[PDB]
């Protein structure tokens, strides 16, 4: 059982609500909009979770 593959990945948290989350993203490239999926290298093997 891989501990990394079964863990809730924190994206954000709201300590607020006034003001609401205002995300100005002027560099709206796909990695900067939808997020990145980075990988770990294990002996030349690409892995992700």
């Amino acid at each position: 059982l891989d501990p990394a593959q079964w863990r809730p990945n924190l994206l954000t948290s709201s300590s607020s609500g006034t003001p609401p989350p205002i995300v100005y993203e002027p560099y709206a490239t796909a990695p900067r909009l939808f997020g990145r999926l980075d990988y770990l290298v294990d002996r030349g093997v690409w892995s992700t979770n």
Binding site: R36, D38, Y39, L40, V41, W46
Partner: protein, 49 residues
């Protein structure tokens, strides 16, 4: 690289003094963002009295 670093935005305290031949700016003044950022045109007279 498998995974980079998420570098946060940095408030810029420097000021940029570009230097260029006028035809080098003829191809760079087309952006309205250029006019908004660089506002002081220090233009050298090619001929002195």
């Amino acid at each position: 690289a498998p995974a980079g670093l998420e570098v946060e935005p940095f408030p810029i305290q420097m000021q940029v003094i570009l230097v260029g031949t006028p035809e080098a700016f003829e191809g760079l003044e087309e952006d309205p963002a250029f006019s908004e950022l660089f506002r002081i045109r220090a233009e050298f007279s090619p001929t002195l009295p």
